Each structure stands twice: as C-alpha cells, then as structure tokens.
C-alpha cells in the first residue's frame, strides 16, 4: 500500500509499505529513497511519535495515510 512522509522543508516522499512493516523498515526506506539516515529520523503520524518496535498497523496506519517526518536535528 502507499502511505505519504511530508518533511517540515515541503517534501512529500511517497512510501510502498505493507500493514506490517516495522518503523525501523519504514525508516529504512526512507533512508533508501531520501538519503536521510534512521537515527536522525522522527516521525510523527496522528500526533503522535512513532517508535521502534511497533508495525505500521499498531498505529493503525492505512492506505493512503500521510506521516510526517521531523529531523532530531530541528527540535520541537
């Protein structure tokens, strides 16, 4: 399924996930289609910040749900 990462600085990377799939792995694509590593990845869906451990599923993340993705680098 598709799901959306839209970055503070404009940026809307499209993702192909499965329902399944671990932060870590999402993170990982991320890093495999931006260019930007997984440690300095924060990522925020429903207001809330994802963690490692969890599947796209423990947070109910459906086709077509837009995340958004905040470096640590810029705090909050």
Same mark, same amino acid.
């Given at each position: 399924? *598709?799901?959306? !990462?839209?970055?503070?600085?404009?940026?809307? =990377? @499209?993702? &192909? !996930?499965?329902?399944?799939? @671990? =932060? &870590?792995?999402?993170?990982?694509?991320? *890093?495999?289609? &931006?260019? =930007?590593?997984?440690? *300095?990845?924060?990522?925020?869906?429903?207001?809330? *910040?994802?963690?490692? /451990?969890? @599947?796209? +599923?423990?947070?109910?993340?459906?086709? &077509? +749900? @837009?995340?958004?993705? !905040?470096?640590?680098?810029?705090? /909050?």
């Amino acid at each position: 399924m *598709q799901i959306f !990462v839209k970055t503070l600085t404009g940026k809307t =990377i @499209t993702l &192909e !996930v499965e329902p399944s799939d @671990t =932060i &870590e792995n999402v993170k990982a694509k991320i *890093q495999d289609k &931006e260019g =930007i590593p997984p440690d *300095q990845q924060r990522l925020i869906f429903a207001g809330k *910040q994802l963690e490692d /451990g969890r @599947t796209l +599923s423990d947070y109910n993340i459906q086709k &077509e +749900s @837009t995340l958004h993705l !905040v470096l640590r680098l810029r705090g /909050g």
